[PDB]
């Protein structure tokens, strides 16, 4: 199965080397991610020499490899079906290749977080927010991976989800690897982004559900492309998950001098960065709109 994944990954790579794609070198870059994923799988296999049956039984690893095969087939099939539209930036098929690149980036980050050094550590994974940790240990103990439905019902007991439509918005926010499971790593990422835990889902409602500035699955170059249309409107800004620093936010904005910059707020929650940035005249027009949410 592992060798079937390599040949599928290999095929995606060859599809992505087509000069017609004019494929942007910036993260997330499938030409980096796939060989990096291969190298890391190679590392895991090497540490499990002999004890290959322990590895082959690990629940997380089983879910991982299944998703990897499924994502790589889905990418192959996207080229097959999209044909010439793969080359028109702005085509839906091309947008889907970008979303897939992001999903591969999230998969590799999750793999590395669960198998750092190639040995399974999902059961000893250290959850960043102490409140969030305590919820995970209480409901799931030392499990690495739980089905969406089962994550949803446990979370709902402590932080009520308003509606099925919000549950689905929530799922597409937290399930970075897009596989209907929630890992302890994905949980850590979400609860870092949307802390504090005490108001977790109201934070996420304010920052993502009702905020026009939030860009679910958007890369650095897509932010830059999107703000380009607001180049004559200084104070326009949008924000999103950083791809390369998973767990932290990236804000893109148009300066009065006609630059498009992106920054990763530190030592300041998103909430405060956004409010300060409003007040200082930098973050005024979320996705170029005249009206800005009041996050106070």
């Amino acid at each position: 199965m592992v060798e079937k994944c390599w040949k599928l990954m290999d095929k995606v790579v060859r599809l992505c080397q087509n000069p017609k794609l004019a494929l942007k070198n910036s993260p997330p870059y499938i030409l980096d991610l796939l060989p990096d994923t291969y190298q890391h799988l190679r590392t895991i296999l090497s540490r499990y020499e002999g004890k290959m049956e322990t590895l082959g039984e690990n629940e997380y690893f089983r879910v991982f490899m299944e998703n990897l095969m499924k994502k790589t087939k889905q990418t192959i099939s996207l080229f097959k079906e999209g044909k010439e539209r793969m080359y028109e930036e702005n085509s839906q098929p091309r947008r889907n290749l970008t979303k897939l690149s992001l999903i591969f980036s999230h998969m590799l980050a999750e793999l590395k977080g669960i198998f750092p050094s190639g040995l399974f550590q999902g059961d000893t994974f250290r959850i960043t927010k102490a409140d969030a940790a305590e919820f995970w240990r209480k409901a799931f103990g030392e499990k690495t991976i739980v089905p969406w439905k089962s994550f949803r019902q446990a979370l709902h007991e402590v932080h009520p989800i308003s509606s099925g439509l919000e549950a689905m918005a929530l799922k597409s926010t937290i399930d970075l690897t897009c596989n209907d499971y929630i890992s302890v790593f994905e949980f850590d990422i979400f609860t870092r982004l949307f802390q504090p835990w005490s108001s977790l889902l109201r934070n996420w409602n304010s920052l993502a559900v009702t905020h026009p500035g939030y860009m679910a699955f958007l890369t650095y170059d897509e932010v830059k492309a999107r703000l380009q249309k607001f180049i004559h409107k200084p104070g326009s800004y949008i924000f999103r998950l950083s791809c390369t620093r998973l767990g932290q936010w990236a804000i893109g904005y148009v300066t009065a001098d006609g630059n498009i910059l992106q920054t990763i707020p530190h030592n300041k929650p998103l909430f405060q960065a956004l409010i300060d940035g409003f007040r200082e005249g930098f973050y005024l027009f979320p996705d170029g709109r005249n009206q800005n949410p009041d996050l106070t």
Binding site: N25, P27, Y29, T244, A250, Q262, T263, I264, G277
Partner: peptide, 10 residues
């Protein structure tokens, strides 16, 4: 190492 340009905030 392949990175995008992230710079200091305003």
């Amino acid at each position: 190492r392949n990175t995008n340009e992230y710079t200091e905030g305003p």
